[PDB]
């Protein structure tokens, strides 16, 4: 089993703020970033997709959503969404494949201030 795990399947964060949602995968000996497949999706949208060495992305999400790639080699795919609209509420789908593959879903609610 190659298992993707998440710290929180539910994030609650107020509007105008920032949030970093996380998907942790096990890192094998001698990890080659070029083999690492990662994508973040909401329903019908591609938030970010990192394949074949670097990053289909939805209309709304640049200036906004970025993968933190300096944490990749250590086995964390971290999607960081800055200024958080109420557009960003929903179910986020995390997926990582290095060799084997697995996925996790995460819920994000966003409350007005």
């Amino acid at each position, epitope marked *: *089993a*190659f298992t993707v795990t998440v710290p929180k399947d539910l994030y609650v964060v107020e509007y105008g703020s920032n949030m970093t949602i996380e998907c942790k995968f096990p890192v*094998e000996k*001698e990890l*080659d970033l*070029a*083999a690492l*497949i990662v*994508y973040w*999706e*909401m*329903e*019908d*949208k*591609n*938030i970010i*997709q990192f*394949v*074949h060495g670097e990053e*289909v992305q*939805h209309s709304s999400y640049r200036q906004r959503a970025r993968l933190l790639k300096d944490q990749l080699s250590l086995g964390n795919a971290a999607l960081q969404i800055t200024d958080v609209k109420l557009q960003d509420a929903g179910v986020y*789908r995390c*997926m990582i*494949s*290095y*060799g*084997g*593959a*697995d*996925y996790k879903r995460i819920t994000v609610k966003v409350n007005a201030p």
Partner: antibody, heavy 118, light 108 residues
Framework: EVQLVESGGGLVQPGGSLRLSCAASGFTFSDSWIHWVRQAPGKGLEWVAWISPYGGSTYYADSVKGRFTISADTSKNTAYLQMNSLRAEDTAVYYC???????????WGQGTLVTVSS | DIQMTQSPSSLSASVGDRVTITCRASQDVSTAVAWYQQKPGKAPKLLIYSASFLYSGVPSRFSGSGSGTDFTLTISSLQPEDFATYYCQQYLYHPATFGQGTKVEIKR
């Protein structure tokens, strides 16, 4: 149990089009990982394109990149391989396949033959 | 991209024989190799995944071994059901590539 049923093959011209269809049954299409694999006559298996049906996420082999378009309709439980600007070299049996998450592809369709010729 | 080369291409064995097919990965793929069976006019059948493990429903006479570069698929006692073409495949690097063919025919 879990089945993949393919449609839309046939004979067309170079520069012509086609849409292959993949009918998914017996599993959650929401969480799956779907690929198109092709086999030219006498030749071996070549991977072509994949889609994550949840979001629109797709990625292609450099072979067919920019020509083929892979998509999915979640409400129809179907993935589509849209083949544009075909060449004779694109002639093969086309399979759609489900990713077996631990590794490899567990479920395949029966295949649909696409022949491209003048 | 990674070549997967298989060998031998053709093999003639008998029912009950031990059969060994090997696959050589162009670069280290770790354990990300899988093995398939194919009979003419039929889609590939998944046999082995993660280079070692057996897929559900695949007879225990099918085994697989390796990591890194070299991989072996082994049939302990060759059944009449088992004459086909066998493919190794690596899913680690894009594109997923297939070693192309090992045909097990029946000795006579």
């Amino acid at each position: 149990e879990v089945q993949l049923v393919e449609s839309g093959g046939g004979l067309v011209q170079p520069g012509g089009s086609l849409r292959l269809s993949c009918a998914a049954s017996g599993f959650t299409f929401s969480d799956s990982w779907i690929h198109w694999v092709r086999q030219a006559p006498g030749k071996g298996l070549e991977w072509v394109a994949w889609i994550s049906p949840y979001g629109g996420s797709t990625y292609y082999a450099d072979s067919v990149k920019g020509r083929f378009t892979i998509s999915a309709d979640t409400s129809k439980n179907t993935a589509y391989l849209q083949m544009n600007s075909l060449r004779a070299e694109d002639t093969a049996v086309y399979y759609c396949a489900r990713r077996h998450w631990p590794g490899g592809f567990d479920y395949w369709g029966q295949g649909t033959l696409v022949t491209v010729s003048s | 991209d990674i070549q997967m080369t298989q060998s031998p291409s053709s093999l003639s064995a008998s029912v009950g024989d031990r059969v060994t097919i090997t696959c050589r990965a162009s670069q280290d793929v770790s354990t990300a190799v899988a093995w398939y069976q194919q009979k003419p006019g039929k889609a590939p059948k998944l046999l082995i995944y993660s280079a070692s493990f057996l897929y559900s429903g695949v007879p225990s006479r099918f085994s697989g071994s390796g990591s890194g570069t070299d991989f072996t698929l082994t049939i302990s006692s060759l059944q009449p059901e088992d004459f086909a073409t066998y493919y190794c495949q690596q899913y680690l690097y894009h594109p997923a590539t297939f070693g192309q063919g090992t045909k097990v025919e029946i000795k006579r």
